[PDB]
């Protein structure tokens, strides 16, 4: 019942990279400054997804989490090429509240459980990227590029069994669109898990958020719509209250 509004930030070499081509002379790509803006306009949680080159990535991500954790006080999730237990554990110890796995969880589902048993299920988020292929929802890894042959309906159940705290449900069919979350995919996954479901991909207007929530999402994640100011968050959370949704205000 209690719904959340989450912001996603793409990170490269320690700086925020915008997901569209809007600009502003003052808007620096400093994650701490952007994190403070989000914290201060009432975003519930932040996720960072790091696309940095192989070689500097692991210390770049540790540096990032240390700076943002000192300075902001909403939960932070970190992800993007977290391959193993040691990497994830180092990030949680340097300050991240949660780590997000996709490819490595698919390839080694025990990883979910190892993190959950050490730091608590709350610390493990599994991002499931899914697409319709020949009439069925399949799971994709390597940033939407490898069809794993695993059914979405099988992987959701297994993720919960392994001890994940939450699922982000990213519709590859909604990637590059701004006409709404994949409410059909949301409805399909909802009876298969008791976990919080975070909807991702497709957000364009305030109504979209309403509709995801009514399809059974517990949170909705977006990037551009908030960074560009195209949706004012206080206004989003007042609209949602008015339409029957329990949000923090
Ligand atoms: N969280 C997250 C996230 C994940 C992916 N991804 O698993 O490709 C891309 C962008 C994101 O903001």
Author numbering: 2 to 250
Task: Reproduce text from the manuscript describing this model.
Computational design of KE07 involved construction of a theozyme to catalyze the chemical reaction, which was then grafted into the scaffold of imidazole glycerol phosphate synthase (HisF) from Thermotoga maritima. Catalytically essential residues from the initial design include a base (Glu101) that facilitates C−H bond cleavage, an H-bond donor (Lys222) to stabilize the phenoxide intermediate, and a π-stacking residue (Trp50), which was designed to stabilize the transition state and favor substrate binding through interactions with the aromatic ring of the substrate. This initial KE07 design (Round 1; R1) catalyzes the cleavage of 5-nitrobenzisoxazole, with 103-fold rate acceleration over the noncatalyzed reaction and a turnover rate (kcat) of 0.018 s−1.
The mutations in R7 and R7-2 (Phe77Ile, Phe229Ser, Ile102Phe) result in further optimization of activation energy. Finally, crystals of R7-2 with the hexahistidine tag crystallized in configuration B with the hexahistidine tag in the active site (even when soaked with substrate). However, when we removed the hexahistidine tag, we captured a high-resolution structure in configuration C with product bound (configuration A was present in low occupancy). However, in later generations (R7 and R7-2) evidence for turnover was only observed with configuration C. By R7 and R7-2, configuration C (which was the only state we saw associated with product in the crystal structures) becomes the dominant substate sampled, with configurations A and B sampled only rarely. In the most evolved versions of the three configurations we obtained from our structural studies (R7, A; R7-2, B; R7-2, C), configurations B and C displayed lower energy barriers than A (16.8 and 16.4 vs. 19.0 kcal mol−1, respectively), which is consistent with the gradual conformational selection of state C along the trajectory.
